[PDB]
Amino acid sequence: MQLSHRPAETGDLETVAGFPQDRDELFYCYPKAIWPFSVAQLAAAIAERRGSTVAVHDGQVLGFANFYQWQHGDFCALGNMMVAPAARGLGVARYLIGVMENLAREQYKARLMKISCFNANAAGLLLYTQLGYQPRAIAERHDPDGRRVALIQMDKPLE
């Protein structure tokens, strides 16, 4: 992958909003969203968040992420991590996580990145582990069906 990145733009929203393929994928990346996902839901997140970034390869937006929490000199928390269904497992998430780590360090002076990952998302848990994130706590949350899920709260120092 020759990958690049830039801030998210209005024109990207329809593409990015197409990434979650089912209600599980949507919950894992945006638990407050309601299925079906929409550009309006995506735009609302962007508005209340920081750092919304896309990853681009060969003219295609393949990934998106942002911060749902940010505390200058302290940390950021990565949110809305979405990857195009045709580009899963190819390094887009790894790439964007690296981008977001740099952004947290440089723009927020963060010492730590937090990532919270739902228990059912094994692929996320494994990736973040491979990227040097360590599990710190488990919180109870509830899915759209009112079922109890475990949110695994991980972090990583940035340097």
* Residues annotated within a binding site for Zn(2+): 5, 57, 140, 142
CB 153, min distance to ligand CLS, A: 9
Binding site, residues? 5, 29, 57, 81, 83, 89, 91, 93-94, 121, 126, 130, 140, 142
Q: Is the backbone peptide bond immediately before 36 cis, with ω within 30 degrees of 0?
A: yes
CB 128, min distance to ligand CLS, A: 8
66 membership: H or E segment, kind and range: strand 60-71
Binding site for CoA, residues? 29, 81, 83, 89, 91, 93-94, 121, 130
Alpha helix (H) ranges present in 78-141? Answer: 92-108, 122-130
Q: Beta-carbon neighbour count of residue 27 at 10 Å?
A: 22
29 membership: H or E segment, kind and range: helix 23-29
Binding mask 85-124 for ligand CLS (x = CB under 6 A): ------------------------------xx--------
Contacts of 112 by beta carbon, 8 Å cutoff, 6+ apart:
74, 75, 155, 156, 157, 158
Binding mask 138-157 for ligand CLS (x = CB under 6 A): ---xx--------x------
Binding site for ligand CLS (CB under 6 A): 29-31, 68, 78-81, 115-116, 141-142, 151
